[PDB]
Coordinates of C-alpha atoms and ligand atoms in Angstrom, one line a residue:
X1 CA 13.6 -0.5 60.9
X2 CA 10.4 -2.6 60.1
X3 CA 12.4 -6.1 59.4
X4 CA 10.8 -8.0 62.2
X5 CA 7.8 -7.7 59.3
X6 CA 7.7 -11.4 57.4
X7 CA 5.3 -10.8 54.4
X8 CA 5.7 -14.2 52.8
X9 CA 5.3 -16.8 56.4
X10 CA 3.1 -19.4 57.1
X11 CA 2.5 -19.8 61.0
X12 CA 4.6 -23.2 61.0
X13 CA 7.4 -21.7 59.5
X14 CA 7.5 -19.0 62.1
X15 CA 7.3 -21.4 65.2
X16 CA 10.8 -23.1 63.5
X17 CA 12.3 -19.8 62.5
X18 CA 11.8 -18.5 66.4
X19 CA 12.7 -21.8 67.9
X20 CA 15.9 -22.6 65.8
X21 CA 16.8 -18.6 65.0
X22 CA 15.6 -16.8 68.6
X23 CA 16.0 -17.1 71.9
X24 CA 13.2 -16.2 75.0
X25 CA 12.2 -12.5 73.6
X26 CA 12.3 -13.0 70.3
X27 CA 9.2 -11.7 67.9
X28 CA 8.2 -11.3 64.4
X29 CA 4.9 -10.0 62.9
X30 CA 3.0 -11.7 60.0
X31 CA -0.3 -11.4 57.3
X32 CA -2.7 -14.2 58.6
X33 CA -3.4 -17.4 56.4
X34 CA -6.4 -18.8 58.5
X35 CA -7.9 -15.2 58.3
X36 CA -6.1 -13.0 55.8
X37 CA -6.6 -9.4 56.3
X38 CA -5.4 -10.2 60.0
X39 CA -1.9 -10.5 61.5
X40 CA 0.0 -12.5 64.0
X41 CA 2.3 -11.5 65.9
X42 CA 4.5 -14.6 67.0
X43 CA 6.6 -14.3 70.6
X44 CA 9.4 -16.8 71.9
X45 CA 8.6 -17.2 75.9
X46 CA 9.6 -19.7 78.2
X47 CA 10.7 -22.4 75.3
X48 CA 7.6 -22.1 73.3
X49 CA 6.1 -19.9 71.1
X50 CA 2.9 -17.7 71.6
X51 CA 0.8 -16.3 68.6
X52 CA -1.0 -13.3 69.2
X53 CA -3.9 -12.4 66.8
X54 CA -4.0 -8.3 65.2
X55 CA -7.3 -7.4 63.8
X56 CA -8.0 -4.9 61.2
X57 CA -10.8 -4.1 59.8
X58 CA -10.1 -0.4 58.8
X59 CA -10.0 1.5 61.6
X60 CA -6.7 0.7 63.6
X61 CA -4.9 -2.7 65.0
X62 CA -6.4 -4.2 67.8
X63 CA -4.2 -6.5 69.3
X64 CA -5.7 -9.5 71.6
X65 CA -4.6 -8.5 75.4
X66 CA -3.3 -5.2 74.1
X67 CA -4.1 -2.0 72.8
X68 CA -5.2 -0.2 69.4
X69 CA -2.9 1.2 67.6
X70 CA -2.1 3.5 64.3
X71 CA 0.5 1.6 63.0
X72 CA 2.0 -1.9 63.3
X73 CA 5.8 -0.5 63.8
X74 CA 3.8 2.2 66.4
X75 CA 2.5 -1.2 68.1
X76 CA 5.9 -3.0 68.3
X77 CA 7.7 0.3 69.4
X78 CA 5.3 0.9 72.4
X79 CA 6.1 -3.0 73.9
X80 CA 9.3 -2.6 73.2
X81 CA 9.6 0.3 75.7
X82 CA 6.8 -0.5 77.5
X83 CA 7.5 -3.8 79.1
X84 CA 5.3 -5.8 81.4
X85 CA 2.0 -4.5 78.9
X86 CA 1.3 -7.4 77.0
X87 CA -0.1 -10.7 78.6
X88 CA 1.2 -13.2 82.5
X89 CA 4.0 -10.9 80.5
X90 CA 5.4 -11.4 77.2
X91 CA 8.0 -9.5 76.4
X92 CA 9.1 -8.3 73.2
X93 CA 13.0 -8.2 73.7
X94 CA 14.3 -8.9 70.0
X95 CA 13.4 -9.1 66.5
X96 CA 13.6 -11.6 64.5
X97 CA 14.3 -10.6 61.1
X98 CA 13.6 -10.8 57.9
X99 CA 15.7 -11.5 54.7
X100 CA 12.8 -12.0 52.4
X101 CA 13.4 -8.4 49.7
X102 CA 9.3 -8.8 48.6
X103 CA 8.5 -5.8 50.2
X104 CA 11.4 -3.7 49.4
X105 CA 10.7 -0.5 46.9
X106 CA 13.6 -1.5 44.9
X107 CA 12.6 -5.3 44.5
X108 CA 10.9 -6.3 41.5
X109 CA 11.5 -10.0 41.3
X110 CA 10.2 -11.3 38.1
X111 CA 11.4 -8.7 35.7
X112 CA 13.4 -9.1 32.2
X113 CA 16.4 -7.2 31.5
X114 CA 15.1 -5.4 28.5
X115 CA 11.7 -4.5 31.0
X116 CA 14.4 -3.0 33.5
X117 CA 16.4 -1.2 30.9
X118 CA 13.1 -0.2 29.6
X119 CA 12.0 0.7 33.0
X120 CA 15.4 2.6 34.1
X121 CA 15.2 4.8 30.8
X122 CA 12.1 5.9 31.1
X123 CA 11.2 6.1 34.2
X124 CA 14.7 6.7 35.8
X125 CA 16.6 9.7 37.2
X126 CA 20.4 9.5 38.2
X127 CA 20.9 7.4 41.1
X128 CA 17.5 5.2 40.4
X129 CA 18.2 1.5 40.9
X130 CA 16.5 -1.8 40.8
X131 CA 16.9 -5.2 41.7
X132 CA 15.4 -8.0 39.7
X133 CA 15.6 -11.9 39.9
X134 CA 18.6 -13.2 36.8
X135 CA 18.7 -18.7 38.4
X136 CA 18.7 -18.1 41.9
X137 CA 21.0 -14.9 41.6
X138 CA 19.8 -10.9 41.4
X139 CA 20.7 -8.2 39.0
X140 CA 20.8 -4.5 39.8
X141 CA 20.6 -2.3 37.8
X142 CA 21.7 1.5 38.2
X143 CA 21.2 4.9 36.5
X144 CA 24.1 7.5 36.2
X145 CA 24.4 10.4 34.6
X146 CA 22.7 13.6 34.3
X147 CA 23.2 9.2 31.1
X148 CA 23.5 5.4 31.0
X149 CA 22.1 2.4 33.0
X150 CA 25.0 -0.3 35.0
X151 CA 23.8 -4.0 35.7
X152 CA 25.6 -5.1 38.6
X153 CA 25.2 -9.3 39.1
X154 CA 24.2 -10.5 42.3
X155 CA 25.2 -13.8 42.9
X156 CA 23.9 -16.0 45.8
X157 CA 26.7 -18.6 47.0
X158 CA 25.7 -20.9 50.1
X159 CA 22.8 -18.7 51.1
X160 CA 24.9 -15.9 51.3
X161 CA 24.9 -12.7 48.3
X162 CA 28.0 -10.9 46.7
X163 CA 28.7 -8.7 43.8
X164 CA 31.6 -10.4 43.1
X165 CA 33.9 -9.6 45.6
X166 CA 34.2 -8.4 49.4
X167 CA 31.5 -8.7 52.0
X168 CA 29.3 -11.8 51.4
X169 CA 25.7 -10.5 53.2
X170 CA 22.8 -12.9 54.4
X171 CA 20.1 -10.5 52.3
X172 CA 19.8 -8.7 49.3
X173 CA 18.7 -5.6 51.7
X174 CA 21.9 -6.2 53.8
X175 CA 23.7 -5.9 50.1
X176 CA 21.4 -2.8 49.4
X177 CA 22.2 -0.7 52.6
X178 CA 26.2 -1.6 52.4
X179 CA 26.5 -0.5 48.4
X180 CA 24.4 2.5 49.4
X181 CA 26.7 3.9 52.0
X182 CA 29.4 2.6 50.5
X183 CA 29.3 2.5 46.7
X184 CA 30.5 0.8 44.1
X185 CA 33.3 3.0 41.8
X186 CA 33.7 1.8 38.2
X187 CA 37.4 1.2 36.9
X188 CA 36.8 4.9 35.3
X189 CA 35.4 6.9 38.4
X190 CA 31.9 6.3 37.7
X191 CA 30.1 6.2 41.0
X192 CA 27.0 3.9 41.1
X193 CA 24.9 5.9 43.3
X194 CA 22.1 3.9 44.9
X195 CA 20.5 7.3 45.4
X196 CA 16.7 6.3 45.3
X197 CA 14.6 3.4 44.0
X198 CA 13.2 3.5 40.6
X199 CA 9.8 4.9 40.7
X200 CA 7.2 2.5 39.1
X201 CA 3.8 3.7 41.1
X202 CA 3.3 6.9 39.4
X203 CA 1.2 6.7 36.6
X204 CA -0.7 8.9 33.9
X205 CA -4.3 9.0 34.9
X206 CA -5.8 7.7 31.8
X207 CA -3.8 4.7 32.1
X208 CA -5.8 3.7 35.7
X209 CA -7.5 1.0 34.2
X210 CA -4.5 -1.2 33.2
X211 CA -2.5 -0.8 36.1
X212 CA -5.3 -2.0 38.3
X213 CA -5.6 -4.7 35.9
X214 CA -2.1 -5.5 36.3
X215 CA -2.4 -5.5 40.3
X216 CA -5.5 -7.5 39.9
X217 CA -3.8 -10.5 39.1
X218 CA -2.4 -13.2 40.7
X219 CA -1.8 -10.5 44.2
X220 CA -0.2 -7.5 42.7
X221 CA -2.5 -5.0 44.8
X222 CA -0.8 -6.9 47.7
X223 CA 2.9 -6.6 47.0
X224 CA 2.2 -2.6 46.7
X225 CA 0.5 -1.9 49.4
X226 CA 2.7 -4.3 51.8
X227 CA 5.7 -2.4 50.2
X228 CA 4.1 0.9 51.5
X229 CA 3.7 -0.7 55.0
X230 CA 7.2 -1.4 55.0
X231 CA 7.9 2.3 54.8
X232 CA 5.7 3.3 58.1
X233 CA 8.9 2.7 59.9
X234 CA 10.1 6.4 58.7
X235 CA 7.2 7.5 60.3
X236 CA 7.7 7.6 64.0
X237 CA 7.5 11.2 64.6
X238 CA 6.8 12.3 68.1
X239 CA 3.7 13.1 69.5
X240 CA 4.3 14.3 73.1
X241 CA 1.6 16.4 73.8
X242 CA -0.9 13.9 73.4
X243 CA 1.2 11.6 76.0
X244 CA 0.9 14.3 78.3
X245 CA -1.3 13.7 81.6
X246 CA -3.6 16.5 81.0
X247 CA -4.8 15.6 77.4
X248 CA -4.9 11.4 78.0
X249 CA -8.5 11.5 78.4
X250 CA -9.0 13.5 75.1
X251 CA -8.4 10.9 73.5
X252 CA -10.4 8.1 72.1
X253 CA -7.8 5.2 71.8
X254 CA -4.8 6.6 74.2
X255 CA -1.6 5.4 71.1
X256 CA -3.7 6.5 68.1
X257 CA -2.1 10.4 68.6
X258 CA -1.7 13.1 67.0
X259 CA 2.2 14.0 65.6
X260 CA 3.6 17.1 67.7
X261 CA 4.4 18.7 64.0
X262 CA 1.1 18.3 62.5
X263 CA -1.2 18.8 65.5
X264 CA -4.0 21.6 65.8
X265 CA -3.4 23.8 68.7
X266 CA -5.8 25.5 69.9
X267 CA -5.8 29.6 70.9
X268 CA -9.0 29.8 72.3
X269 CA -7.2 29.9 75.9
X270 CA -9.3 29.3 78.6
X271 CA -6.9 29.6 81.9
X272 CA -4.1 25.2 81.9
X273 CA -3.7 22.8 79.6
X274 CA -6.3 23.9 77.0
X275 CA -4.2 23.7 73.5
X276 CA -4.7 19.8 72.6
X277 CA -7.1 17.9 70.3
X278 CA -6.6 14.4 68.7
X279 CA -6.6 16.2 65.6
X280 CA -4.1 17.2 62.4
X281 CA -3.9 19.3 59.5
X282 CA -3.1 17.8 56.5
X283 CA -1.7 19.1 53.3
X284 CA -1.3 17.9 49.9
X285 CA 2.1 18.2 48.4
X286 CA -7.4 22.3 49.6
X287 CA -6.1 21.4 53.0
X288 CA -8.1 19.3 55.7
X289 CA -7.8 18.4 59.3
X290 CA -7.8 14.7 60.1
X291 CA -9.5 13.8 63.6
X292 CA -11.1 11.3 65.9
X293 CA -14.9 11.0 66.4
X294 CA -15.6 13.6 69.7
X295 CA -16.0 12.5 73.0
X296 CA -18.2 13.8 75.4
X297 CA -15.4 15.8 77.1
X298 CA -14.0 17.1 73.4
X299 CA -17.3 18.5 72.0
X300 CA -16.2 21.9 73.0
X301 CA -12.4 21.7 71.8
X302 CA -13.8 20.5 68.6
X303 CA -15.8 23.6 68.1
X304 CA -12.6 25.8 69.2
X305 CA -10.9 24.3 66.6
X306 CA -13.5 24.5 63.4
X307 CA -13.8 28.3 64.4
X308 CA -10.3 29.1 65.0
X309 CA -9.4 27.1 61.6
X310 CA -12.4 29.1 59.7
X311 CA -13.2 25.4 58.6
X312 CA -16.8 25.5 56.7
X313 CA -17.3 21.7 55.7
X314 CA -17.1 18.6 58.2
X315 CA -17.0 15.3 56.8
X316 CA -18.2 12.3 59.0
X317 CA -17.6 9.3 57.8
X318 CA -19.4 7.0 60.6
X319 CA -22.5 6.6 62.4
X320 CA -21.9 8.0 66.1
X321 CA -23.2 4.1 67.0
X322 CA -21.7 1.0 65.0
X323 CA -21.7 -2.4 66.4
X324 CA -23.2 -1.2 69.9
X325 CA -20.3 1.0 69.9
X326 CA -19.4 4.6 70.4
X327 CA -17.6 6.1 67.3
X328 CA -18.4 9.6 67.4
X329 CA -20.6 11.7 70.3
X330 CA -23.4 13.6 68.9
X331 CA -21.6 17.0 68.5
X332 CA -24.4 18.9 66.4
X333 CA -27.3 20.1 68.3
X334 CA -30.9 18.2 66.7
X335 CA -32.8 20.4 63.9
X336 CA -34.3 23.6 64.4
X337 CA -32.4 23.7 67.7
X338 CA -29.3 26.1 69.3
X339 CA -26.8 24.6 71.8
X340 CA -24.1 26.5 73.2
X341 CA -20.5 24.4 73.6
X342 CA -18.7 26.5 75.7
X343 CA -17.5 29.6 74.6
X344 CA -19.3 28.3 71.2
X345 CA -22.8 28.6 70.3
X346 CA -24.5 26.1 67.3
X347 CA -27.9 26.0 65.7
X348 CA -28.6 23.5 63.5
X349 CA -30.7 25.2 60.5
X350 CA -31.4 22.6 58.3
X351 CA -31.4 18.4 57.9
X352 CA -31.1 17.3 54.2
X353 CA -31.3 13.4 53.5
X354 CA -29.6 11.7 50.5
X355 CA -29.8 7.9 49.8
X356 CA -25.7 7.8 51.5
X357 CA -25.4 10.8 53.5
X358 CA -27.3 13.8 55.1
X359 CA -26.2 17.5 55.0
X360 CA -26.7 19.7 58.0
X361 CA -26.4 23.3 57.9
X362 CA -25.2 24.6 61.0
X363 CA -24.3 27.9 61.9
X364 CA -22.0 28.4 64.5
X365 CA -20.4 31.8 66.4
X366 CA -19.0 32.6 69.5
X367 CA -20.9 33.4 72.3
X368 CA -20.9 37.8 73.0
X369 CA -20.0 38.1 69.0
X370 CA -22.9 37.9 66.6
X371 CA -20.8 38.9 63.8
X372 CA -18.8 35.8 64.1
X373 CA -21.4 33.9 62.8
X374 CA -20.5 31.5 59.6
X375 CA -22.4 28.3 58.2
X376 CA -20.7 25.2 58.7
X377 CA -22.1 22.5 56.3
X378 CA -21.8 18.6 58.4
X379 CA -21.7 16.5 55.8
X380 CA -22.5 13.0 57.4
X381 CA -22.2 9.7 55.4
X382 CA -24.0 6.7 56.8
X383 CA -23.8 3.8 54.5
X384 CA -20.1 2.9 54.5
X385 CA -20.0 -0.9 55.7
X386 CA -19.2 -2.1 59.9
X387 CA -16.1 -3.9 57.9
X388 CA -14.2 -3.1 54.9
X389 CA -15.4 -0.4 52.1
X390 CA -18.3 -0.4 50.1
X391 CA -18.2 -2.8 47.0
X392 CA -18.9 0.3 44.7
X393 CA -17.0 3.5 44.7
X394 CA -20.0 5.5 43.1
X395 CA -21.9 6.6 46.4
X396 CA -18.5 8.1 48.2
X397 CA -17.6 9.7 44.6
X398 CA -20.9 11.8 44.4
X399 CA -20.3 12.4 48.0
X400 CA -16.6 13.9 47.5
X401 CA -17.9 15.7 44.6
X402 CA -20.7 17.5 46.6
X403 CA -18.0 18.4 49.7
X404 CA -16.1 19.7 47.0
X405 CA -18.4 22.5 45.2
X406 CA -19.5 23.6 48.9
X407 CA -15.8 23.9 49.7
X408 CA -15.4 25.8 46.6
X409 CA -18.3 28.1 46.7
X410 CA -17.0 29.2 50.1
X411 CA -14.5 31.9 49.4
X412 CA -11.9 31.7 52.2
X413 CA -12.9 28.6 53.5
X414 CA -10.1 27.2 56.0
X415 CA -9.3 23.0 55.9
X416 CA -12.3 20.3 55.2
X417 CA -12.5 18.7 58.4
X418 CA -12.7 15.2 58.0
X419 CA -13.8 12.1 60.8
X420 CA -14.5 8.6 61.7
X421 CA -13.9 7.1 65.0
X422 CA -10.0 6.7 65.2
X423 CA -9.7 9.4 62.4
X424 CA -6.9 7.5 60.2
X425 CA -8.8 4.8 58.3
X426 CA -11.7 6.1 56.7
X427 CA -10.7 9.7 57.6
X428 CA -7.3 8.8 55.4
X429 CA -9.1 7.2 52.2
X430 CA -11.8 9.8 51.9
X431 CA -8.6 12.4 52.3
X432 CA -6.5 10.2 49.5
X433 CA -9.1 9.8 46.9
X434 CA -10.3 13.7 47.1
X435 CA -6.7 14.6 47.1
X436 CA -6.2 12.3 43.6
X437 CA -9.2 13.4 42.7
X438 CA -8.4 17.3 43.1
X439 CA -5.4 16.8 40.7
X440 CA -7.5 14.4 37.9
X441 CA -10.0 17.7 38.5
X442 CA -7.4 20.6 37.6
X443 CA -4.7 18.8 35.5
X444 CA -7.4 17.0 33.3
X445 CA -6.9 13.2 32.3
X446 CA -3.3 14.0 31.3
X447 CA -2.1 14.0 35.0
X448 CA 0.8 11.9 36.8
X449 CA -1.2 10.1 40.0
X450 CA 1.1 8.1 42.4
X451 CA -1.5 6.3 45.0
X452 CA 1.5 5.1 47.6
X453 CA 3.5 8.5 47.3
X454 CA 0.1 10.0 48.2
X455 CA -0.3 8.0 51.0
X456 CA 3.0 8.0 52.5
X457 CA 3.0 11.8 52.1
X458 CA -0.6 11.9 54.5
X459 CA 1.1 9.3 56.7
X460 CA 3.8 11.6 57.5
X461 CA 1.1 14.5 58.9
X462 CA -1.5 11.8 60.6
X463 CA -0.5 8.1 61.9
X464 CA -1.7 5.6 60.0
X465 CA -3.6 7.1 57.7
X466 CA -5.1 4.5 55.0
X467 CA -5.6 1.2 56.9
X468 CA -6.0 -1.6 55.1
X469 CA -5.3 -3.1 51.5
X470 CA -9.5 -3.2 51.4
X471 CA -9.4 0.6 51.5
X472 CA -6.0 1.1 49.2
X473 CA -7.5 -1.4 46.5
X474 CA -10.5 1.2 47.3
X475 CA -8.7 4.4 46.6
X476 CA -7.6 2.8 43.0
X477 CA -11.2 1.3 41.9
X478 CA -12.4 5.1 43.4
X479 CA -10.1 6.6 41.3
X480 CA -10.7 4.2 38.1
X481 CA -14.7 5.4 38.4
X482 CA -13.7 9.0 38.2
X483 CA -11.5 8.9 35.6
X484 CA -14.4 6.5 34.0
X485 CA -17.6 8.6 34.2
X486 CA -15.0 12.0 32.7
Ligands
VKS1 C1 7.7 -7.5 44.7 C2 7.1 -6.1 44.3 O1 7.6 -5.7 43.1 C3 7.2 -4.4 42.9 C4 7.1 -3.7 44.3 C5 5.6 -3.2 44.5 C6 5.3 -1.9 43.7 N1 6.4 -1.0 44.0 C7 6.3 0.0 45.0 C8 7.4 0.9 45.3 N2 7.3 1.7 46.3 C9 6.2 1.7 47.1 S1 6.2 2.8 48.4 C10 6.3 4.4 47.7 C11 5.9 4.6 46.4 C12 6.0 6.0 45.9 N3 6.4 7.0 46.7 C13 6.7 6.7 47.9 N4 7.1 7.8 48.7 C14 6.6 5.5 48.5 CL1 7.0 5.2 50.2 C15 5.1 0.9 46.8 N5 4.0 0.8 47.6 N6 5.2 0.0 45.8 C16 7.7 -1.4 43.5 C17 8.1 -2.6 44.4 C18 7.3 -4.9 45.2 N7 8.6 -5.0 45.9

């Protein structure tokens, strides 16, 4: 679980909650105030409490006197099993949770009756529910059937919530998890089924430009995307191999790895340990390959890997400097020129500039077999921002729409290989949006589009994938332009 999360805190409120609710150990994690975009994460040491800053700017969470990680709930679960990490210690021993249902995907809050009904007939399946504010008390609402729609009141009594009889919980979620193992049976032997929440994020793609209108205002872009972040929790796959002695220093930031399910091994055997790169394939429902930026020692592995996958498009989406820091190694050999990576041989043919990227047309093979040989096309973009995403969506669009008629015109092309530094922040929006985009492309304007489904499906083959609510606020307005200029 994820419940040490408290979307709604200010920093006062979560000295009192740890000093009256927790003991020496206890944590919770918060969106800053003083710095939104940030997060704190607040620990109970010693009789006082400690508030340690999380930074992200789009490419992973850097926590102060700690490491960068893919995920917050990846962060918390490595000091929780990791002790003695973060500093003099601080130990994260319990969390402190939170009762607050904001970021819950059944929680709608302000929400009529007739909007739920509405909403539930619809929208809804059997088993969808809901749970909307009534003065102080809830309502949920259920589907059944194969039809008809239950309300269910929730009342809150003494800062405790009931349906009316039995167990008296301290949260709605508390109320939600109970009623959904064990549920409620109508008089009649109807079951009320809390079998999923009501889905409310898909959405017809001509209709883009009133539901970020909606999430514009005062924010709803916020409340989504926090819900999504609440679901990272049922991401915690392993990833093993990347822990492994061996293949530490093949990676950039040693927790940002690759899922054991997902990963790219590599067959090109050269004999111990020669199957791992930070790297994994990703498929929607075109497929692509998510990675980190190379490192000196990866250049060859990363060449293994685009000729063993038949890949025949790279997308970089940073400058190998940024900040006076290393993002990516300079993999490609310089124009006109042929450089052998190991076992792998590359010449670079041809430099193209455009006003946000460059094209490079390299042509790799492996060495002893000429008629290996296929053109790989680097497509580089340089202008995306140090911080955040570009204020326009046009220059990535033309971009994505360029990778995609070379990826087309390439029969039997294997995945789009896509990278920045970390490979999960701008690797996972350029990935999202040209995986929206693919469908708005094929199924014309008339097309269901479900932005956190989308995401939350890419999470599950790459950690982390889609940062921040800068670059989700980016996929929609990305989206909205294509839709736009069709
Ligand atoms: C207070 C707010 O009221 C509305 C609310 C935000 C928007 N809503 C919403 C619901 N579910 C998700 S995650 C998701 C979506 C679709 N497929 C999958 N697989 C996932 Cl994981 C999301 N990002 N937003 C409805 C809930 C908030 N509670």
């Amino acid at each position: 679980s994820r419940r040490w999360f408290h979307p709604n805190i200010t920093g006062v409120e979560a000295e009192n909650l740890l000093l009256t609710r927790g003991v020496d150990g206890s944590f919770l994690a918060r969106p800053s105030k003083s710095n939104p975009g940030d997060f704190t994460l607040s620990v109970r040491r010693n009789g006082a409490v400690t508030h340690i800053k999380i930074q992200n700017t789009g490419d992973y969470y850097d926590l102060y006197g700690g490491e960068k990680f893919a995920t917050l709930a990846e962060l918390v679960q490595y000091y929780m099993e990791h002790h003695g990490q973060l500093k003099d210690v601080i130990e994260l021993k319990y969390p402190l949770n939170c009762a607050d249902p904001t970021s819950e995907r059944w929680f709608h809050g302000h929400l009529s009756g007739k909007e739920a009904e509405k909403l539930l007939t619809e929208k809804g399946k059997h088993g969808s529910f809901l749970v909307r504010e009534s003065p102080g008390d809830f309502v949920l609402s259920v589907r059944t059937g194969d039809s008809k729609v239950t309300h269910v009141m929730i009342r809150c009594q003494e800062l405790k919530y009931d349906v009316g009889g039995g167990e008296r919980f301290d949260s709605l979620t508390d109320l939600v998890e109970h009623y959904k193992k064990n549920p409620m049976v109508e008089t009649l032997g109807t079951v009320l089924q809390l079998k999923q929440p009501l889905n409310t994020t898909r959405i017809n793609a001509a209709e883009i430009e009133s539901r970020v209108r909606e999430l514009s205002k005062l924010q709803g872009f916020w409340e989504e995307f926090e819900t999504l972040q609440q679901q990272e929790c049922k991401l915690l796959y392993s990833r093993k191999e990347g822990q492994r002695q061996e293949n530490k220093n093949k990676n950039r930031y040693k927790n940002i790895l690759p899922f054991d399910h997902t990963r790219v091994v590599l067959h090109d055997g050269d004999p111990p340990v020669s199957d791992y790169i930070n790297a994994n394939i990703i498929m929607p429902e075109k497929s692509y390959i998510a990675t980190q930026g190379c490192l000196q020692n990866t250049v060859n592995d990363f060449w293994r890997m685009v000729f063993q996958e038949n890949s025949r498009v790279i997308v970089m989406t940073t400058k190998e400097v940024e900040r006076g820091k290393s993002k990516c190694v300079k993999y490609w050999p310089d124009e006109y020129a042929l450089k052998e990576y190991g076992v792998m041989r590359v010449r670079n043919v041809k430099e193209s500039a455009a006003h946000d990227y460059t094209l490079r047309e390299l042509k790799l093979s492996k060495v002893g077999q000429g008629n290996t040989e296929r053109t790989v096309w680097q497509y580089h973009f340089r202008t995306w921002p140090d911080h955040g995403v570009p204020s326009d969506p046009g220059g990535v669009l033309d971009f994505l729409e360029e990778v995609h008629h070379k990826q087309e015109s390439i029969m039997d092309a294997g995945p789009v290989v896509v990278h920045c530094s970390a490979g999960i922040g701008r690797t996972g929006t350029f990935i999202v949006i040209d995986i929206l985009i693919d469908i708005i492309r094929e199924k014309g304007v008339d097309c269901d589009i479900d932005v956190p489904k989308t995401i939350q499906m890419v999470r599950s083959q790459r950690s982390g994938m889609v940062q921040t609510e800068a670059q989700y606020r980016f996929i929609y307005m990305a989206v909205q332009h294509y839709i736009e200029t069709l």
